[PDB]
Write a protein that binds this ligand. Structure first.
Ligand code: HEM
Ligand code: HEM
Ligand SMILES: COc1cc(N)nc(CCc2cc(CCN(C)C)cc(F)c2F)c1
Ligand SMILES: COc1cc(N)nc(CCc2cc(CCN(C)C)cc(F)c2F)c1
Ligand SMILES: C[C@H](O)[C@H](O)[C@H]1CNc2nc(N)[nH]c(=O)c2N1
Ligand SMILES: C[C@H](O)[C@H](O)[C@H]1CNc2nc(N)[nH]c(=O)c2N1
Ligand SMILES: [Zn+2]
Lengths: 411, 410
């Protein structure tokens, strides 16, 4: 069975056959589309075929399908599963799985880079202090003094679900948010709940406006522990505007390194619940979302007020105007400081090239249009006109519940 | 079974039960989501009666006479008519209800808060293209209303056996001509390049300007289509100027006030109305973001950025974005100065969030296609960006249909 997607700006038509390797559910049915819905331990029983399918992919990629090495690995894994109820990945398999999890992330517009991932094997880690060391080395490597480098650090896989490794932060670097008694918020409104957990865990909060949060790190199912990232490792960029001299006076800055730390990496049925990964920013993830969301820094009003816009009626598009200016400043600031960043025009253009190349050599490229189209100026980017098929391939990155909702406290 | 939709800006969570009355197919499976695919790539007496019963059932429910004397009698009456004639005819009240609810059920339409205010023009007695023309002129005049735009639909005879179809060949009743240049570029509107040529291919006398209003190409009862020129005094146009830059007028832009879709099919109780032009009023981004700044449309993006003297060498200057905003400020300012109805994308999306809440409250759901509801600019500063939506097909409905120049036996 062969499916087709059409680009409505260029009439280019591609043919998807990779969807035949799709596995778990999309959430949709013949009677409902859940395409705009954000969200949805293993027995040897269902683990055997999950491992086999992964190894079949792996040995196909290295042109060794059905080789003696393939069959011995199959036999050795299945023996390990039935005698221990799980199995260990080789280094080679682990690297392959992490890269392919990214290659399969249908919501990620940056996947053109998927094969250039630095994989740090932290599966020998045993304590939160060890996790801290591993994460410090990741941040230093990835940052690279502003010449950012994609990377992932993989902590031990889940066993019985009672000994999980977890990074409680949603991203490795993020600013605190403080709800004031009068109802206003100091800092990042998105991080108010997590900031409270940290303060309750004993974090002495400076209660400034751009306080980097501590790492809250859980090893082997023990209670999590607080660590402060050394400030010399946290690269930051003061935000200024190339024409508006008053923009610096807003006093804004943003960190350089986007590092997702709350997701679950699934490879051959194995679940890696702590796997921070990092790349580099698209400008709009700071300037459209991290300041101008009604639920974030809401400098949207202030920028408009200082541009002296008509804020009486929305049809003056004063919100749209200030939104553009803030995104110009973010890109200008990062480039001036030689900190890697990509604007949404370059990133979407690169993704279309990636997507076409993937249809050629792979038979498809799963993609979530709802997330691929940028949060501003959508229809002047080339992905807006691009039909996209969405399906789940494994290995994959998955959401997992917040650990504070599931953790059993030791005391 | 009782699905939940969350708004991630407000944490409001609505429960959808209306989807259980869904019917047609989405295109998706549990293995593959086609939510970003544009398109879905006569009735026999047995297929027809359940469809009619379903519709009559929801009609008599809406007037709180479900299972009443009138209900069962009407149910029986249509049963007899179908067994006899192999089709049936709608009562005027049912026709009006069906059309309003096809609008209410249009999951790609952000403007649905107004759905119950539709003016329905019953044109089922029409027999000829001249008659169609008359009905369409009256529609345009009524809908335009001197700039105080009013939603309207005109419904021509339903399909019978597929041979005697009524079709408006134009995709919209009012559209600007587009001619390809003997060398490279395009004059007018490139989306209409084929149509603008099909008209001359039939006998049009193209004034060969940029903004030449296309003639109507009306097909009645399956015969060859006929050209008609809409009296220009019926075509309200707004000159586009900017509330700042006076060079903006120099661009010499204008757009028509009346968006009027005319190539879709309306399905009520199993019956198919192949010619059912409907109109409302524009959202500002439909003209400026899409009609002006699309690459394959007017593409004056470069001109506007050039006249703003913006750095156009690196994309990271966001010069396209900057120009795009100013163009959409001008469109809104121009319509508003001329007292021609228009809504900005902030107002329309806010209105739609309110409409959603109303529908979940008094109806149990609201089918909605996020890929189409989110505006093509400034998406994440509008309330619909963070609103999860469930998409499903209810009937009565508006459906796509092939272009008649492939279908018609000339
Ligand atoms: C290297 C430059 C990268 C860029 C420019 C980029 C860009 C983006 C953007 C804009 C999103 C949308 C998320 C949102 O709006 O909240 C996203 C999502 C995502 N990216 Fe990438 N990304 C990059 C690197 C990576 C890497 C290194 C990985 C994994 C190894 C990755 C995996 C993902 C995943 C799993 C998502 C899903 C997010 C979710 O579901 O919330 N990305 N990316
Ligand atoms: C009164 C003001 C109205 C507004 C502001 C409005 C707004 C919109 C917009 C922005 C779209 C997106 C379509 C596109 O981008 O091409 C749309 C789609 C649609 N609207 Fe509305 N609309 C209005 C009135 C109506 C009426 C009166 C009807 C029917 C009686 C209707 C039915 C539809 C349908 C069927 C679609 C889907 C179009 C398609 O599938 O291509 N609308 N609407
Ligand atoms: C792994 O590397 C990545 C690089 C880039 N650019 N984006 C992502 C997506 C994940 C991600 C999303 C957001 C959006 C913030 N919402 C609250 C509005 C901010 C981030 F800081 C971040 F990290 C990952
Ligand atoms: C029936 O009433 C309606 C009112 C409004 N505002 N929109 C529609 C959808 C039909 C429609 C949509 C668009 C979108 C911009 N494209 C250039 C991509 C432009 C139109 F010119 C038009 F006609 C119908
Ligand atoms: C490929 C994609 O589905 C296609 O370009 C859609 C996207 N969303 C849209 N949204 C609106 N309002 N109008 C459109 O024509 C489209 N086109
Ligand atoms: C409700 C909706 O699915 C939700 O707000 C999504 C929509 N698209 C998005 N797209 C991006 N890039 N990032 C997001 O957080 C979201 N949020
Ligand atoms: Zn779907």
């Amino acid at each position: 069975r062969f499916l087709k997607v059409k680009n409505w700006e260029t009439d280019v038509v591609l043919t998807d056959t990779l969807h035949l390797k799709s596995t778990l559910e999309t959430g949709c049915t013949e009677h409902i589309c859940m395409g705009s819905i954000m969200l949805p331990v293993r027995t040897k029983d269902q683990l055997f075929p999950l491992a086999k399918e992964f190894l079949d992919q792996y040995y196909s990629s290295i042109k060794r399908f059905g080789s003696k090495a393939h069959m011995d690995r199959l036999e050795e894994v299945n023996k390990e599963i039935e005698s221990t109820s799980t199995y260990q990945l080789k280094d080679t398999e682990l690297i392959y799985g992490a890269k392919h999890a990214w290659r399969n992330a249908s919501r990620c517009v940056g996947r053109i880079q998927w094969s250039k991932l630095q994989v740090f094997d932290a599966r020998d880690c045993t304590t939160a202090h060890g996790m801290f060391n591993y994460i410090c080395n990741h941040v230093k490597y990835a940052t690279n003094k502003g010449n950012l480098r994609s990377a992932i650090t993989i902590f031990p896989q889940r066993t019985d679900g009672k000994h999980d490794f977890r990074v409680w932060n949603s991203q490795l670097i993020r600013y605190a948010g403080y709800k004031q008694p009068d109802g206003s918020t100091l800092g990042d409104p998105a991080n108010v709940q997590f900031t409270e957990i940290c303060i309750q865990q004993g974090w002495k909060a400076p209660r400034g406006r751009f306080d980097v949060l501590p790492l809250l790190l859980q090893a082997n199912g023990n209670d999590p522990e607080l660590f402060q990232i050394p400030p010399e490792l946290v690269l930051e960029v003061p935000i200024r505007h190339p024409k508006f001299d008053w923009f610096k006076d807003l006093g804004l800055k943003w960190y350089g390194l986007p590092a997702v730390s709350n997701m679950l990496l699934e490879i051959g049925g194995l679940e890696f619940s702590a796997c921070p990964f990092s790349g580099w920013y698209m400008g709009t993830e700071i300037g459209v979302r991290d300041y101008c969301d009604n639920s974030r820094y809401n400098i949207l009003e202030e920028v408009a007020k200082k541009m002296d816009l008509d804020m009486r009626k929305t049809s003056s598009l004063w919100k749209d105007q200030a939104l553009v200016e803030i995104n110009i400043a973010v890109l200008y600031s990062f480039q001036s400081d030689k900190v890697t960043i990509v604007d949404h025009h370059s990133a979407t253009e690169s993704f279309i090239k990636h997507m076409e190349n993937e249809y050629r050599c792979r038979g498809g490229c799963p993609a979530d249009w709802v997330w691929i189209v940028p949060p501003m100026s959508g229809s002047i980017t080339p992905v807006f006109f691009q039909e996209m098929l969405n399906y789940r391939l494994t290995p994959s990155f998955e959401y997992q519940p917040d650990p504070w909702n599931t953790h059993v406290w030791k005391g």
